[PDB]
Each structure stands twice: as structure tokens, then as C-alpha cells.
Amino acid sequence: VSLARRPLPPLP
Amino acid sequence: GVTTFVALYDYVASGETDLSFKKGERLQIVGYNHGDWWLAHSLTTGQTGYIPSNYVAPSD
């Protein structure tokens, strides 16, 4: 569940 | 409800759970997914791992 809900990376 | 996505950018994964992929790769989502990161399988390279949803768009 945490793996899905992690912060996203910034766009390049 | 689409299951196939295209990578919009190259992405180098940081962790062992995550898939690295290159711009243009076709990716299919695997199983139940929620949140922002989804388990995917690269139709291009055969690799699997979580992908960040902001790096991909629905594709044929």
C-alpha cells in the first residue's frame, strides 16, 4: 500500500 | 480503464521495486493499482516494476 502511495518524482 | 500506457520521458528508478524505462516505451499495468505508482510490465524490454503515473499517458 505504501508502494502505490509514495510521492511522485518531479517531471524532467 | 485503459491498461496500456506510453512513457513520456526517460525515467531512472531509484529503488529495486521500480521500473526504469525510456521515452516511448509501451507499458502495461499489472493487477490492482491505486495511488500514484502502479505496477507495470514493459512490452518493449520485458522488465517489471512500479512506475510513476505522471511519466506516462494512456496508449493503444
From Swiss-Prot, chain B:
Portion held of the full protein: 82 to 141 of 533
Domain of life: Eukaryota
Role of this protein: Non-receptor protein tyrosine kinase which is activated following engagement of many different classes of cellular receptors including immune response receptors, integrins and other adhesion receptors, receptor protein tyrosine kinases, G protein-coupled receptors as well as cytokine receptors. Participates in signaling pathways that control a diverse spectrum of biological activities including gene transcription, immune response, cell adhesion, cell cycle progression, apoptosis, migration, and transformation.
Family statement: Belongs to the protein kinase superfamily. Tyr protein kinase family. SRC subfamily.
Subunit (UniProt): Forms a complex with polyoma virus middle T antigen. Interacts with AFAP-110. Interacts with GJA1 and PXN.
Compartments in which it is found: Cell membrane; Mitochondrion inner membrane; Endosome membrane; Nucleus
Protein name in UniProt: Proto-oncogene tyrosine-protein kinase Src
Changes after translation: The phosphorylated form is termed pp60c-src. S-nitrosylation is important for activation of its kinase activity.
Tissue expression notes: Expressed to high levels, and with a high degree of kinase activity, in certain fully differentiated cells such as neurons, platelets and macrophages. Isoform 1 is widely expressed. Isoform 2 is expressed only in the muscle.
Domain annotation SH3: ranges: 1-60
